Amino acid sequence: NITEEFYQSTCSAVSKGYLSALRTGWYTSVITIELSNIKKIKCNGTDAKIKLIKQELDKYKNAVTELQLLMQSTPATNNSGRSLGFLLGVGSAIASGVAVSKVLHLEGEVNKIKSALLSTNKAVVSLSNGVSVLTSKVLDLKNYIDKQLLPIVNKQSCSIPNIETVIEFQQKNNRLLEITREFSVNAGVTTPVSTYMLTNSELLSLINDMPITNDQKKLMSNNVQIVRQQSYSIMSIIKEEVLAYVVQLPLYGVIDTPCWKLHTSPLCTTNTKEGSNICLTRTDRGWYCDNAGSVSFFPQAETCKVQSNRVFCDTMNSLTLPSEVNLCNVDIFNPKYDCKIMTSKTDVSSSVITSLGAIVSCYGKTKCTASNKNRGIIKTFSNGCDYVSNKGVDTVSVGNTLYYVNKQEGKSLYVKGEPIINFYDPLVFPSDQFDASISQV
Amino acid sequence: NITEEFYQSTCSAVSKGYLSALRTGWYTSVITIELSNIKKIKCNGTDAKIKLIKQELDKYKNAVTELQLLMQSTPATNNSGRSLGFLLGVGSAIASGVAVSKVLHLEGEVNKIKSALLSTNKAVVSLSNGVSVLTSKVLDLKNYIDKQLLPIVNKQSCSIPNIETVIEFQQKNNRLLEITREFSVNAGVTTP
Amino acid sequence: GVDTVSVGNTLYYVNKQEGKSLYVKGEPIINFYDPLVFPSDQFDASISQV
Amino acid sequence: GVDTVSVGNTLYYVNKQEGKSLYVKGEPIINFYDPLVFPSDQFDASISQV
Amino acid sequence: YIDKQLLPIVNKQSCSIPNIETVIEFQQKNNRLLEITREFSVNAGVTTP
Ligand SMILES: [Cl-]
Ligand SMILES: [Cl-]
Ligand SMILES: [Cl-]
Ligand SMILES: [Cl-]
């Protein structure tokens, strides 16, 4: 159950009650498509059905050629001031998948995988470097072409195939064309992993066969759409009648730990004289999750995805902070943690839509209200930082900007308190601390 | 007519003459596709045209199953120093649409919409919360499957369909597959 | 009359939209400040704050 | 010889690109500054500006 | 004709489904055999004209 508290003293709000799903590691599987090595199409027969097969077989060959050009390259990808995102480190997202992909280029490795998938479509292979991976065969075009399409290709006659075969081949070949299509506009690396790359059935099956915890299996299976978004597909090799690409799946080593979202907004004095005011803003906004005795902090919004009451985050875009970082919500002047803030003289009106309400920073001549769809305006905000819950409120207006509030169910608590900006003498207040803290000020 | 002035004193330039089109609010409509509830495909006939229909009908079922898994989740999305972007507030882009979506989960609301779109493909429905929305039916696979594909599915015979029907069904079903495709890689929320 | 502009190793194509430009001459305001007391560490500031 | 690096709760995989690294030893330059007069609010600065 | 055009659909469990034009063509070629047999069977093996 989601709850929320607004702190009038620091113009901020915390949303509690969430459960964690943090990607901590990676699992790499090798997906294969068995290809038919065919060059020639020996047939002088000008039959329309033969022509259609020839045309489809031509797309097949171009895809293979196109993929071979992609294989020649080494896979790579590249993954505000009121946020602490600049403090983050820089990881290499597909470094694990690429490491596996490089092994696949070694001679014998390809033939090793093909041997394992000879009788079955699912196997575990020991790679020459000494790493085991789940290998899977999702499509056998080699079988279909050699079994259904050989007499119309390998011979001058060329017994004209039925129309249903022409349709069927286009259906089966289509997946190869789409995979090639995605890789070719993404330089061999795609994310999220599409259903062309890995169908819902294949992914669910892969998850079940992943030797992970039953909780992780359940978690990933109920949130496949999120798993896809946190996954990469890496074109590896197309060699000796087999296309292979590495699918890099998220590993959730942290599950069901409490998470909370911190919302922040500018806190300024409200003197009538324009420009005689000083401002203060908490800069530690973002997602927080308890994690191994510390706290994983995610400054950027893109990093975390919320499903009902569970938060999916990526640890690569996080900081590991002392748990005392939470003290900034209760006592920003606490002696255990130096709470991060920024100062300014620019008192501009704005609103932050929270999980269960809205924070309004209203300054100057700005019209700031909250409304119900039926009644209309039910609250007019005064200058300063204020808050309203989503219960009974549908929209909030700050100036010419109308915000819809989240209609998530849950209780809000208004924690009254003197705005801390009132504690500072404007005559000696440093209003040029773009990245600062309580003690630094 | 566009004009422009450069101010040498402050190293800046202003381009005038433009007309506004500002998004100030949101309008939410409910788009519907009538689906045929089919499980079984009773037919032992190994005819190639039957096989193609079966395969296409299998994609249809997987799409439905895939969408049902997506429905289980609550929709959400996340929408330099020389710019003042850091001064901006933080809205919730799909808060209005999601609010409508939640109403649709309430029992009776679904049947209420289906009743309005019974005779027409365009109607306005009063939702139980007290909000009216334009509702639209853009595809009726329920009609097509039950009218063109029932004898080849509901019975052991299974009178083999013409090749043109096999083509036609793939054409109509394709849209459902693509919609499902977009939702599945976008966690149920797409834009544009 | 201009199609491109080059600054260092960077070539910019200009927009070929039709319309009149006006060059408003004026003393660069940076010349009004004494460098000895000029605060050059105001990342987010204003005229009065400087 | 290294495959991963862990900082706090964050596990980074390292690039397995082949190539030689050189560790150039040297006194951390932060040790050269007196903290009593060190400007720690220079968001965009330089050696001489500090 | 049978051994060249119709063997895979007869000699094997698969049975790669033949095109519709072959179905038509075989009926055309086979027809003559059926008619010859037809004439002989109502004429006790001797026909004239
Ligand atoms: Cl045919
Ligand atoms: Cl909105
Ligand atoms: Cl350019
Ligand atoms: Cl990593």
Q: Which residues of D touch C43 (CB under 8 A)?
A: 43-44
Contact (CB, 8 A) for C24 and B3: no
- The tokens for A182 are 């995605």
- The torsion angles phi and psi of A262, rounded to 5 degrees, stand at -100, 125
Identify the H or E element spanning A378. strand A376-380
- Rounded distance between C-alpha atoms, residue A179 and residue A32, angstroms: 12
Q: ∠ CA(A148), CA(A152), CA(A156), 5° rounding?
A: 150
Contact (CB, 8 A) for A245 and A29: no
- Rounded distance between C-alpha atoms, residue B108 and residue B105, angstroms: 9
- Rounded distance between C-alpha atoms, residue A65 and residue A38, angstroms: 12
- Rounded distance between C-alpha atoms, residue D32 and residue B119, angstroms: 83
Q: After which residues is chain A broken (C to N over 2.5 A)?
A: 79
Neighbours of A360 (CB within 10 A): 28
Query: Which resolution in angstroms does this entry have?
Result: 2.4
- Rounded distance between C-alpha atoms, residue B86 and residue B103, angstroms: 35
Distance from CA of C3 to the nearest CA of B (A): 17
Q: How many residues does chain D have?
A: 50
- Rounded distance between C-alpha atoms, residue A87 and residue A298, angstroms: 11
Contact (CB, 8 A) for A304 and A313: yes
CA A25 and chain centroid, separation: 14
Contacts 24+ apart (CB under 8 A), B110-116: B113/B30, B113/B32, B114/B32, B114/B34
Between the alpha carbon of residue A121 and those of residues A136, A206, A408, C37, the distances in Å are 6, 11, 44, 75
- Mind spelling out the 3-state secondary structure of B90-140? ECCCCHHHHHHHHHHHCCCHHHHHHHHCCCCCEEEEECCCCCEEEEEEEEE
Contact (CB, 8 A) for B129 and A374: no
- Rounded distance between C-alpha atoms, residue A355 and residue B52, angstroms: 48
Task: List all residues 6 or more positions away from B190 whose beta carbon is below 8 Å from its beta carbon.
Answer: B182, B183
Q: What is the DSSP string of B131-167?
A: -EEEEEEEEEHHHHHHHHSSTTTSSS---PPPHHHHH
- Rounded distance between C-alpha atoms, residue A265 and residue B153, angstroms: 60
Q: Which residues of E touch A49 (CB under 8 A)?
A: 19
Contact (CB, 8 A) for A99 and A121: no
Evaluate the CA torsion angle A21, A23, A25, A31 in order and state its sign: positive
Contact (CB, 8 A) for B32 and B148: no
- Rounded distance between C-alpha atoms, residue C21 and residue A212, angstroms: 66
The amino acid sitting at E19 is: N
- Rounded distance between C-alpha atoms, residue D46 and residue D27, angstroms: 19
- Rounded distance between C-alpha atoms, residue A74 and residue A354, angstroms: 43
Q: ∠ CA(A296), CA(A299), CA(A300), 5° rounding?
A: 125
The amino acid sitting at B28 is: T
Q: Which residues pair with A135 in a beta bridge?
A: A30, A123
Q: Do B17 and C22 touch (CB under 8 A)?
A: no
Range list of β-strands (E), A265-304: 267-268, 279-282, 286-291, 294-298
Task: List all residues 6 or more positions away from B59 whose beta carbon is below 8 Å from its beta carbon.
Answer: B173, B177
- Rounded distance between C-alpha atoms, residue A380 and residue A83, angstroms: 29
A342: nearest CA partner in chain C: C44
D15: nearest CA partner in chain A: A95
Provide the terminal-to-terminal Cα distance of chain C, rounded to the nearest Å: 39
- Rounded distance between C-alpha atoms, residue A269 and residue A424, angstroms: 10
Q: Which of A199, A225, A406 sits opposite B187 (nearest CB)?
A: A225
The alpha carbon of B9 and the centre of ligand 4 are apart by a number of angstroms equal to 49
- Rounded distance between C-alpha atoms, residue A369 and residue A402, angstroms: 10
Range list of β-strands (E), D1-50: 4-7, 10-13
- The torsion angles phi and psi of C17, rounded to 5 degrees, stand at -65, 140
Q: Which residues of C touch B (CB under 8 A)?
A: 17-29, 43-44
Evaluate the CA torsion angle B85, B91, B96, B101 in order and state its sign: positive
Instruction: With H, G, I as helix, E, B as strand and everything else as coil, classify residue A66.
Output: helix
Only one residue has tokens 């330099």, namely B80
- Rounded distance between C-alpha atoms, residue B44 and residue A159, angstroms: 28
Q: Do E21 and A160 touch (CB under 8 A)?
A: yes
Q: How many CB pairs under 8 A join A and B?
A: 118
Q: Do A440 and D7 touch (CB under 8 A)?
A: no
Neighbours of A421 (CB within 10 A): 24
- Rounded distance between C-alpha atoms, residue A244 and residue B170, angstroms: 29
The alpha carbon of A404 and the centre of ligand 2 are apart by a number of angstroms equal to 4
E1: nearest CA partner in chain A: A159
Helical spans, DSSP H, in A223-333: 224-229, 327-330
Neighbours of E38 (CB within 10 A): 10
DSSP state of A405: P
Task: List all residues 6 or more positions away from B52 whose beta carbon is below 8 Å from its beta carbon.
Answer: A164, A167, A168, A171, B166, B170
Instruction: With H, G, I as helix, E, B as strand and everything else as coil, classify residue B81.
Output: coil
Q: Which of A232, A252, A299, A247 is nearest to A93 (CA)?
A: A232
Q: After which residues is chain B broken (C to N over 2.5 A)?
A: 79
Q: Which of A340, A289, A292 is nearest to A318 (CA)?
A: A289
* Buried b / exposed e along A176-204 (16+ C-beta atoms within 10 A): bbbbbebbeeeebbbbbbbbbbbbbebbb
* Buried b / exposed e along A294-323 (16+ C-beta atoms within 10 A): bbbbbbbbebbbbbeebbbbbbbbbbbbee
